[PDB]
Design a protein around this ligand. Structure first.
Ligand SMILES: [Mg+2]
Ligand SMILES: [Mg+2]
Ligand SMILES: [Mg+2]
Ligand SMILES: [Mg+2]
Ligand SMILES: [Mg+2]
Ligand SMILES: [Mg+2]
Ligand SMILES: [Mg+2]
Ligand SMILES: [Mg+2]
Ligand SMILES: [Mg+2]
Ligand SMILES: [Mg+2]
Ligand SMILES: [Mg+2]
Ligand SMILES: [Mg+2]
Ligand SMILES: [Mg+2]
Ligand SMILES: [Mg+2]
Ligand SMILES: [Mg+2]
Ligand SMILES: [Mg+2]
Ligand SMILES: [Mg+2]
Ligand SMILES: [Mg+2]
Ligand SMILES: [Zn+2]
Lengths: 155, 116, 127, 83, 207, 99, 60
RNA sequence: GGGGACUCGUGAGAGACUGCCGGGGUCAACUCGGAGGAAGGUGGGGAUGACGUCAAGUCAUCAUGCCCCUUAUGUCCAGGGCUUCACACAUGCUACAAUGGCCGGUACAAAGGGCUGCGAUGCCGCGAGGUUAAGCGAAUCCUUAAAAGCCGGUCUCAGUUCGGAUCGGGGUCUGCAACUCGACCCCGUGAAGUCGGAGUCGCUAGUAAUCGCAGAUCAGCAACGCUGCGGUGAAUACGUUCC
C-alpha cells in the first residue's frame, strides 16, 4: 500500500472451459475453503445455461459480464461540513471484479431452491439485460452522472 | 390419517410422521416401522386401513404415549415439590434443577430479560 | 536402470517412476481417476507433459505418501518435471519459464502464543 | 451407588445407629453429619438432623424420600430475595 | 525485568550445563534432591565464596564439584570441613558422594564472586559508588576481560526512594550470541532490606 | 551373527557419537565385528510456561528437551568382549541399555 | 506456602486419592509439573541457569 | 530370505553474497530490471525488548525492612462455601439452514503421549462401557478410524428431517464419597432463534475463512479455554485527502 504497488497473483485456466473468466468465477462463489463445491456449482450453472439457450456457455458469460461491467463509479470524500461523492474513471481490471461479484452477490438472494440454477437464472437474465445485476450498473452510473459537478477532486 | 387421536399429517414419510406422537422420536419410530413391516419410505396419503391397525397395537402394548405420558411427567414433578427436596424447592421458583450456572445465563427456566 | 525422482509440495512426498509407454498413470496401483477424481487436480498432474510434447508417452506410476489430496497432486507435478530432465537434458528452458521446476516453498506458518491462529488476534475492546 | 455394580453406599456410622433402634421399636432423633448417605427403607420410621453449616436441620423420612440422599433436604444456601 | 538470563540465552550454544546425568523414571526424584543439595551449599559456606556448584551422577555414584575463591576455607583444619559436609551430603542422598573441591583462577574476573564482594561491602555500609567502582577497575586489569557492567538496585545508602543505577566500562554486548557473558546475581543483607547486585563480564568471542 | 544389541540415549548431539565412534566402536580390533552408528529419531518434549508470576497470560516462553536416542550398535559376541564392554567407560551424559 | 500444608502434603493422608502434588522447591499447589517435580516459576529460573539437564530454550 | 537404488530418519559440509551483465546515480551509498539458479535482494517464520516511562502488577511462588497475633490472626478435623442471582459488561462455542440436515459407500494427514500405564484381538452390551489377555519403556507395539472432501439416495423452503436449550426416565466410569457440585451414554420432550440497533474487531498468503487430531495440568472432569499441529484454501491493495 503506502510504499508501492503490491504484486499480483496469476491464474490457471479451467480444464472444462478454457477461459480465465471461469476460474475467476468459481473463485468468488467459494466460501469456507470448499473449492470443489464451488466448481460443482459454476459447472452446473454453465451446463444448465445451455439446456435452455443451446449456445455456448462461455459466450453467454462473456456478454452477461459485459452488461454488468461499469466504467464510472463514485467514491466518497469530505471537504467541509458536507461530504460529497466524486465520480472517478474505473481501470479495466477493477471492472471485471465488480461485475463478477454483482453476479454472485445477487444470486444468493433469489427465490429458487438451489444455487445450481440461481446462478443460472442470473447469467441468463444479464445476458439479455434483465436481472438485478444489470440494475446496479445503471444505478452505479446514475448516481455518478447526477454528481458530475464534483469531477475535479481526483485526489 | 389418525393413529391414536394425534392427527398424522399428509404428504410426509412415516419415518418422520410417527414422531409427532408425544412419545416417539427418531429411534422408537424406527422400531415401530420394523416390527409391523411398514417400510421407511411410505407416505401418509396412501396408508392402508388395516396397516394402521397393526401400527396401533404394537404401541399400545409396549410403549407409553400421551394422555398419561403427560401425566407421567407432571406427576413426577408433583412428587418432588411436596417431599421437600431441594430439587423440588427448585421447581417452585423457575430455576435450573441440575446445578447450572445461574449468574449470567439461565434464561430458559426464567424468561427473557427485564432490567430492573 | 530406469529413472526415478522425488517431489514434495506441502508435506506430501512422492516418488515417481518413469517407464516409457502409452500414458497410464497407475498411482499406488490404481488409476488416475480412481483417487484423483477432480478435473482441476488432473490438469496440474499432466501439466508439464504439454511442454515436453509427450502427453501420450511415458506411462508412469508412483508412490504417494503424506500430505493431502492437493499436496499429493502438486508433489506429483514436480516429480514428473524433474523426471523429464534426466531422460532428456535438452528441454531445460522449456520447463524453466513454466515454473514447474520450482518447489514453491510454502508451508504452514506456525501458531503463535497469544494469537489464536498464525496471524489472527483476539478482540481488542478498548474499554 | 451411582453405578449399580458396587451397590448403594451408605456411611457405616449411621447404619449402626439405625439398626440398634429398629430392632426394639425405638424412634429417637439422630444427630448426624452424613449428607452423602442414601435412604434405605430400613429407617422409614424415624427422623434425622442433617448438617448444613449453621445447624442441624431436622428431616422426617416419611415414605417416598427413598432413593434420594439425606443432603437433598438441607438447602445450605438461604436467599430469601433481592428485595 | 526485560533482559533474560544471559546464561539461558546461550545455553548449549556457548555455555554448558551445570548438572550431568540421564533419567526417565527417576528424573523427578533426582531434581528433588539436586536442589536439596544446593540448599546445603549456600548456608554454611557463604564465607568461602562459592562460584558455582556442579552436580553429576553416574549410576549411584554422585560427584559434587564446587568452585570457590578460598579453597582452604572449604577444606577447614586440614580435613575437618571438606569431610564435615561429606558426612552431610551422604546422609541426605544415601550414596558415596565424592566432593571434589576445586579452585578459581581469577576471582576478580568471574561473576557471582565479583557480584558477591560488592554485596559484602554494601552489607557493611561502604558508599555504593565506591563499592561498584572498585569491581569495575579490579576486573579490567586482567588480560581476558574486555568489559564489565555492574547494576545495583534497592534502598541504596539507607534512603527511602528505591533507585537503580549502573556503571559500565569497555563493551558488554548482551545480544551477541557468539560472545561469552558471565553473569552473577547476589542479594546483599542490609539493615533496611535488600540490595541486589548484577554483574555482567564479557570475555570475548568463541567459535 | 551379531546378537548383542545395545542402545544409546543422551541429552545432546556430539556427546553420544564422539563417545561411541571412538569408544563404543572399539570392538572391531578386539576380535569382533560391528555395523556402525545407526541414527534414530530425536524425541522432543515441549513445555510452555507463563513468564510472569502474576496476571500476564499473554507472555510465555518455550522449553524443549531433545532426547537423542541414537546409534544402534550391533556387535559380534566374542567371549572376551561380552563383559569387556562393561569395562568400557562411558561418561555421565550417555546411558547404555546392553540388555 | 503455609508450612503446615507443605508438611501435610508429603505424609500419608486418609483416602489415598486425597493426596495432591506441590512443588519441591517452593510450595505452590498450582501449576506443578510431574516430569520435573517443579512449578512453572522454579522451572523457569532453573532452566536458564543450566541447573536441570536437557532443557534449553526452544525455537521451531 | 533379502537388497544400497528411491524416500525417510540425522551426522558433517556446499548454497545467496547486489557476487556476474545491461540502465540511473558525486568515478558514492543505493535503486529499477535480466542471466544463472530449489531459493534474490532481510528468501519466509521463531529466539533476542536499548536509556528509560507508568509511585504499572504481585508482600499470595519465593526472598525481605518495619509494624502486628502468640489459650490465637497459630494448628488438626469433619460438614459448608468459592458454583448462590431482580440484573449490567466482557471473551468464546453452537446456531438460525439447501454452498445445508439425515442416511449407506469410500479415499488422503501431521505433530504427539504411554509401566500408578496404553487394551490389539476375541466374546457380550442399542450405547457409554464390561471382560479376557497378545504385543510393547516403544521409528517395533498400542494410542489410530483423521474430519471436512468424493459417489450415490432422501427431505423441497416449513420454527421444519433446521435448532438442541430445558426437563422427566433408566444406566455406565473414576473415587472413601458425585446431594448441594463431575463427564459420558441411551429413551421421550422439543425452548429462544429466520443473519442481529448506535457503535465496534481481526486479517496482505499457505493469510483470513472453515475442518478435525494431539499435548500440558489430571483419579475423573465444567477442555467450547490455552499451547501446538496439519487438511481444504480465497477475494483486494487505486492511493495518503480523511480517522
Ligand atoms: Mg487469552
Ligand atoms: Mg491452520
Ligand atoms: Mg484485555
Ligand atoms: Mg487432585
Ligand atoms: Mg538482532
Ligand atoms: Mg501503585
Ligand atoms: Mg493493587
Ligand atoms: Mg509475611
Ligand atoms: Mg475441610
Ligand atoms: Mg471461580
Ligand atoms: Mg430459511
Ligand atoms: Mg438435528
Ligand atoms: Mg457419512
Ligand atoms: Mg456388536
Ligand atoms: Mg451429496
Ligand atoms: Mg420466533
Ligand atoms: Mg504486515
Ligand atoms: Mg485430562
Ligand atoms: Zn516452585
Amino acid at each position: 500500500p503506502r510504499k508501492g504497488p503490491a504484486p499480483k497473483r496469476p491464474l490457471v485456466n479451467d480444464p472444462v472451459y478454457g477461459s480465465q473468466l471461469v476460474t475467476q468465477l468459481v473463485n468468488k462463489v467459494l466460501l469456507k475453503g470448499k473449492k470443489s463445491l464451488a466448481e460443482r456449482i459454476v459447472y452446473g450453472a454453465l451446463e444448465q445455461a445451455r439446456d435452455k439457450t443451446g449456445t455456448d456457455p462461455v459466450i453467454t458469460l462473456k456478454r452477461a459480464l459485459d452488461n454488468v461491467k461499469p466504467a464510472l463509479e463514485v467514491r466518497s470524500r469530505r471537504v467541509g461540513g458536507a461530504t460529497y461523492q466524486v465520480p472517478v474513471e474505473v481501470r479495466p481490471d477493477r471492472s471485471t471484479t465488480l461485475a463478477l461479484r454483482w453476479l454472485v452477490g445477487y444470486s444468493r438472494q433469489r427465490r429458487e431452491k438451489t444455487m445450481i440454477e440461481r446462478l443460472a437464472n442470473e447469467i441468463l437474465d444479464a445476458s439479455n439485460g434483465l436481472g438485478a445485476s444489470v440494475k446496479r450498473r445503471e444505478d452505479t452510473h446514475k448516481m455518478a452522472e447526477a454528481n458530475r459537478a464534483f469531477a475535479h477532486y481526483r485526489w | 390419517a389418525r393413529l391414536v387421536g394425534v392427527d398424522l399429517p399428509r404428504d410426509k414419510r412415516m419415518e418422520v410422521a410417527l414422531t409427532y406422537i408425544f412419545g416417539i422420536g427418531r429411534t422408537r419410530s424406527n422400531e415401530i416401522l420394523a416390527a409391523t413391516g411398514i417400510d421407511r419410505d411410505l407416505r401418509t396419503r396412501d396408508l392402508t386401513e388395516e396397516q394402521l391397525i397393526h401400527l396401533r397395537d404394537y404401541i399400545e402394548a409396549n410403549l407409553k404415549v400421551e394422555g398419561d405420558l403427560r401425566r407421567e411427567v407432571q406427576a413426577d414433578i408433583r412428587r418432588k415439590i411436596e417431599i421437600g427436596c431441594y430439587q423440588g424447592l427448585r421447581h417452585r421458583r423457575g430455576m435450573p434443577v441440575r446445578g447450572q450456572r445461574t449468574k449470567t445465563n439461565a434464561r430458559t427456566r426464567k424468561g427473557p430479560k427485564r432490567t430492573i | 536402470r530406469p529413472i526415478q525422482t522425488v517431489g514434495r509440495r506441502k508435506e506430501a512426498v512422492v516418488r515417481v517412476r518413469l517407464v516409457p509407454g502409452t500414458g497410464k498413470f497407475d498411482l499406488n496401483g490404481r488409476s488416475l481417476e480412481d483417487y484423483f477424481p477432480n478435473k482441476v487436480h488432473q490438469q496440474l498432474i499432466k501439466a508439464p507433459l504439454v511442454t515436453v510434447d509427450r502427453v501420450e508417452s511415458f506411462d508412469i506410476f508412483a508412490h504417494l505418501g503424506g500430505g493431502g489430496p492437493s499436496g499429493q497432486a502438486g508433489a506429483l507435478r514436480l516429480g514428473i518435471a524433474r523426471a523429464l530432465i534426466l531422460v532428456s537434458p535438452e528441454d531445460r528452458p522449456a520447463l524453466k519459464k513454466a515454473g514447474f521446476l520450482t518447489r514453491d516453498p510454502r508451508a504452514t506458518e506456525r501458531k503463535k502464543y497469544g494469537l489464536k491462529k498464525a496471524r489472527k488476534a483476539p478482540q481488542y475492546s478498548k474499554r | 451407588p451411582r453405578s449399580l455394580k458396587k451397590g448403594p453406599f451408605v456411611d457405616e456410622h449411621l447404619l449402626k445407629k439405625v439398626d440398634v433402634q429398629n430392632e426394639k421399636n425405638t424412634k429417637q432423633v439422630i444427630k448426624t453429619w452424613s449428607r452423602r448417605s442414601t435412604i434405605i427403607p430400613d429407617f422409614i420410621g424415624h427422623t434425622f438432623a442433617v448438617h448444613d453449616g449453621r445447624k442441624h436441620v431436622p428431616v422426617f423420612v416419611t415414605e417416598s424420600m427413598v432413593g434420594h440422599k439425606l443432603g437433598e433436604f438441607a438447602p445450605t444456601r438461604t436467599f430469601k430475595g433481592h428485595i | 525485568g526485560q533482559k533474560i538470563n544471559p546464561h539461558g540465552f546461550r545455553l548449549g550454544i556457548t555455555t554448558d550445563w551445570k548438572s550431568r546425568w540421564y533419567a526417565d523414571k527417576q528424573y523427578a526424584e533426582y531434581v528433588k534432591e539436586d536442589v536439596a543439595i544446593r540448599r546445603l551449599l549456600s548456608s554454611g559456606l557463604e564465607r568461602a565464596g562459592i562460584a558455582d556448584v556442579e552436580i553429576e551422577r553416574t549410576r549411584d555414584r554422585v560427584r559434587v564439584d564446587i568452585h570457590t575463591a578460598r579453597p582452604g576455607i572449604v577444606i577447614g583444619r586440614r580435613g575437618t570441613e571438606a569431610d564435615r559436609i561429606r558426612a552431610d551430603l551422604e546422609k541426605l542422598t544415601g550414596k558415596q558422594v565424592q566432593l571434589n573441591i576445586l579452585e578459581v583462577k581469577n576471582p576478580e574476573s568471574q561473576a557471582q564472586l565479583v557480584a558477591q564482594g560488592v554485596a559484602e561491602q554494601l552489607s557493611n555500609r561502604v558508599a555504593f559508588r565506591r563499592a561498584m567502582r572498585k569491581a569495575i577497575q579490579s576486573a579490567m586489569r586482567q588480560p581476558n576481560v574486555k568489559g564489565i557492567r555492574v547494576q545495583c538496585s534497592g534502598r541504596l545508602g539507607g534512603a527511602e526512594m528505591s533507585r537503580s543505577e549502573f556503571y559500565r566500562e569497555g563493551r558488554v554486548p548482551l545480544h551477541t550470541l557468539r560472545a561469552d557473558i558471565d553473569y552473577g546475581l547476589y542479594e546483599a543483607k542490609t539493615t533496611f532490606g535488600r540490595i541486589g547486585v548484577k554483574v555482567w563480564i564479557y570475555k570475548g568471542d568463541i567459535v | 551373527g551379531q546378537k548383542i544389541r545395545i542402545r544409546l540415549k543422551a541429552y545432546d548431539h556430539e556427546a553420544i557419537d564422539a563417545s561411541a565412534r571412538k569408544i563404543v566402536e572399539t570392538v572391531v580390533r578386539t576380535g569382533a565385528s560391528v555395523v556402525g552408528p545407526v541414527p534414530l529419531p530425536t524425541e522432543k518434549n515441549v513445555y510452555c510456561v507463563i513468564r510472569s508470576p502474576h496476571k500476564y497470560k499473554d507472555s510465555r516462553e518455550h522449553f524443549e528437551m531433545r532426547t537423542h536416542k541414537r546409534l544402534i550398535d550391533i556387535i559380534d559376541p566374542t567371549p572376551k568382549t561380552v563383559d569387556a564392554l562393561m569395562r568400557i567407560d562411558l561418561p555421565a551424559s550417555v546411558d547404555v541399555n546392553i540388555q | 506456602a503455609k508450612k503446615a500444608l507443605v508438611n501435610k502434603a508429603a505424609g500419608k493422608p486418609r483416602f489415598a486419592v486425597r493426596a495432591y502434588t506441590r512443588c519441591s522447591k517452593c510450595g505452590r499447589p498450582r501449576a506443578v509439573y510431574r516430569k520435573f517435580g517443579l512449578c512453572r516459576i522454579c522451572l523457569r529460573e532453573m532452566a536458564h541457569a543450566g541447573e536441570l539437564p536437557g532443557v534449553q530454550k526452544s525455537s521451531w
